[model samples]
Target: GLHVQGGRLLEGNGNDFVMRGVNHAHTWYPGQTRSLADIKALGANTVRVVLSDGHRWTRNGPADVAAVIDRCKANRLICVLEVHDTTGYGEEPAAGTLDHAADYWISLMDVLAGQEDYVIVNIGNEPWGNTDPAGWTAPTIAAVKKLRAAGLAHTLMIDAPNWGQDWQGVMRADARSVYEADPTGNLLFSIHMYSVFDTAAEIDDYLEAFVDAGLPLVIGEFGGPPDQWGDPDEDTMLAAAERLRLGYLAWSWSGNTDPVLDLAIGFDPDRLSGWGQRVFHGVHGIGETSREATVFGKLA
Candidate 1:
């Protein structure tokens, strides 16, 4: 199993494992089964796949999830499975709570039980919104406790509030408490850098703060160009992750309403969008920095 130790993520083999990857909207693009292989071919070592637990979209049953894990194994990419239905709990009524997401994970225990080395259980995706995210703390702790109680020992990844950007610094301030709450200490903190990360300085400040606090951190999500709201400073994110030896997963591989965020157009790797080119080919991007997890028996 991938575990957190000394504030860093390490493979079960005790080798460092940084997540250089992209997000796949699996629930929505279930037909694109080859997306994982194509992403691996592009030099990704992992993929943070989006799944729904029948809250806001069609449910991804146990068989589908099992096949997803199989695909990840075949492609040799670490799988970070996240529940998409928990995207915005506090504000969006349609967005399910972390408790529901926990139950969903428990339901798939039969499929997830012995796959710890290859899979990371992301309790939920951006589990809260801008609406009083001060309320995020307790529920998050509860969800983690529930998962642990269910005998699911996979490394757990928890996303920050405020749509995972953690704009208000709630995650930063309370991360220590949450990390301590996990008995296994196999927990990772995820912060999505988007509009909230408007400058290189801001990016460094937030990332540095986590390191200074001795908390395991990863840039769980981020995007590039056509700055819709504010500049995401993606280049800074890449370089910073490289500097800190931390992991990062690009916003998406494809199938987004905002096509600019799509890495491969229409799921075709031959047609790399501008965002795709930079993320996969840039100096600090996956092509140059991604090293295959040693668990896969290949050294990059």
Candidate 2:
């Protein structure tokens, strides 16, 4: 439970595959039960739980609003709670700007600021809908400042403007501008990668640039088409990660009927036998007795 260093994360094995797991909605919904033991069995050492804005949990709520941190600790997995599905972004009138979203986020952070098992706090997911790149900096800075003031020194993970971090564009444009850095030096930038969205070569180029810039990066989410078995892009991405010692967590793991898995082509039940289960567990190759062992097995 020591403070993880910033800049670039190197796993115990010298290769970085910190821990892989899925984002679960159980925190928001009732009657959806999932235990920490199940997550460990699925080879997941991390779980990204979404916390919605304006929800009862965010306002007038306790720090361990959903008790997710307890489950993660019991299962020995790191819990990265994301501020997903907010009212600050999108096409609806209710969609406010990041500045407006700060109040809700501050309140949420106030609740869970000192939790031991909380490894990452993502500002928002996708940042699409009514979110704009021009307006992102101020609110993000404000939040980070607030967290610093509260003495919460945990590694803060920040997502990019357009639906997860857009490495090809945003990261390339001005890497420093996309992320908010703490003078305390405990910030990590997060980005999402999908085989359908970015080509293998494209991903490699971005990784190279990211490494060259001396910034810590994480693949917060990823998936592929149903018919696709392997991802050369993901493979290249992993190779670069090994070279740079980066950490990544795959999209998700749900027994059945999970949205990310259900919508994924390869994980579709009708398309492939044990598609969801296999793809969820089978995509990454487990390493044996090498740096790969710690990186792959730790995640597998």
Candidate 3:
């Protein structure tokens, strides 16, 4: 149903801006408004609004999603409504199968079937543990088909199996085959990168591979405790993404009481030890740094 032309995406200028922001803000909750003015002041061009599957809106009422969408429009920021908590894997009373989740999702789509500003529908966040990667494919395909049938033609993003797309095992038989067969060209594959687990080269290698395959990729979520990894600093990763023409949304916007010493800006000098700052900040080394300027000034 999306007005697809030549198998390419038709979008706008703001699409080129790197989306860097947080997750799980309750814009719908009474007196819990996420001020667009604040987000713009922070230099965030986007925010991921989360909706739990079993939320009251998913059942009896129209989810108060419009409020967030209007805010994004007012602020000139993009909004991604991520289905954070679902009756799927790793949750109590799990939906158990993608088929079951699909029924719930169709109902959700009915609620959000027509909004131009709502860019992505994340089918499930971090589908892992007791959820078979192979099993998810068919149902997700069916879900997309159903959405299209219902006239919900927005770009659909599919998270890779095993806590998001595991780049290391992405080339394996089942993973490769299932993704290759995915019919939607509008699909963007999402991966979460955390400093504790992956190196810069590892992340670059994985992203490059996906690009070579002519597929779009997005870093949906990522962050870590201070003094985590080596080489590929957060800024380095951002640079690579810019070069690769990929999109990214940083882990979170707020909510951490004990803020990790972010090497990206050298803001938490008390937390990070010595020369580790240099390593984390890459070439610029913190203050008067582009990363710092972008995170603080431009992206505030």
Candidate 4:
């Protein structure tokens, strides 16, 4: 069961974990389940799965989440489940609140129950945006309390505001308080890298902050070039993550509204995009950095 000990994400057996993985937009393309297997074949050991809870898109019911979890285990990958509905919450009028996000998770508790070892529940995906950055801190802490109170202790992962870029430094500044607030102390902070982290110094500094603070962190989401948001210094992002022993998951596998962020062209393994190849095969990409989560214990 993945747990946080002093600044490191440790496996059930106590080995250090650095997530070398990719994101699967499961809500948009649930039928593309084969991608889970495909990702494992490409050397990824973790998959950040995107799911919805009847807020913006269709709801992923208990059975649906169960299937996704089963597939992740079957593929020998650690599953990081996130609710997509809370994306850009504070800024996007249509986005749902973190409290609502917790309700959604509680609703799916039947499926998530007893699955702590293989799954990490990301309460929300970019639950807040740049709008009222200061506001994100309180709601975030509250949501963590709510989830923990609800008896959900699956190593909760919290994302930063500013569309998860943390431009306001809210997540970085208040992380210690948040970490101490969670009674279980099993929380992991997440930062999504995009244009704002184009410089190696920026990437190194932000990640080092968490390291210096003795907190556990992961690059919950990131991308390569030509992003509609901004050009990401993917090299620096992956490089820093590797050097610091931080986990990272690239933006997506397929079904992205923006094809540029898709790791594979049209979900075809043979058709790896320029960015996809760089992430899956380049230096510090999955092939070089990924190690089996240590739970599967050397698949025969």
TM-scores for candidates 1 onward, in order: 0.98, 0.73, 0.69, 0.98
What residue runs in model 2 are displaced by over 4 Å at the alpha carbon? 1-6, 10-17, 55-60, 63-66, 87-101, 108-113, 129-132, 165-168, 178-180, 226-243, 255-260, 263-280, 283-300
Worst 10 residues of 1 by lDDT: 223-232
- Which wins on lDDT, candidate 3 or candidate 4? 4
lDDT of each: 0.93, 0.53, 0.50, 0.89
Clashes of 2: 8
Q: Give candidate 2's error at residue 65 in angstroms.
A: 2.8
**Which digits, one per residue and each the tens of the lDDT, describe model 3 over residues 1-300?**
221223222353222334454453352333445444554444455556655555423432245665666666566566666665443354335434444444555676655656544456666665543345454556656655665566555666666555564533532223344444445455556776665234677778777877776556667765544443433245555666667756666544333344442222222223333333432233422121222112122423
Say which candidate scores most in lDDT: 1
Tens-digit per-residue lDDT, 56-147, candidate 1: 99989999999999999999999999999988787888999999999999999999988999999999999999899989999999999999
Expressed as tens digits, the lDDT of each residue in 1-300 for candidate 4 is 678897888877898888999999998897787999999999999999999988898999999999999999999999999998988976898898888889988888888887887899998999887878888888889988998888886889999889899988999999998898799889999999988887889889999999999999999999778555567889999888988999999988987776878889988987998989999999988999899888888777
Q: After superposition, how far is residue 30 of candidate 3 from its true place, in Å?
A: 5.7
> What lDDT is obtained when candidate 4 is compared to the true structure?
0.89
TM-score, cand. 2? 0.73
lDDT of 2 at 274: 39
Candidate 1 vs 4: which has more TM-score: 1
2 against 3, candidate with superior TM-score: 2
Q: Which residues of candidate 4, in runs, are more than 4 Å off?
A: 227-229
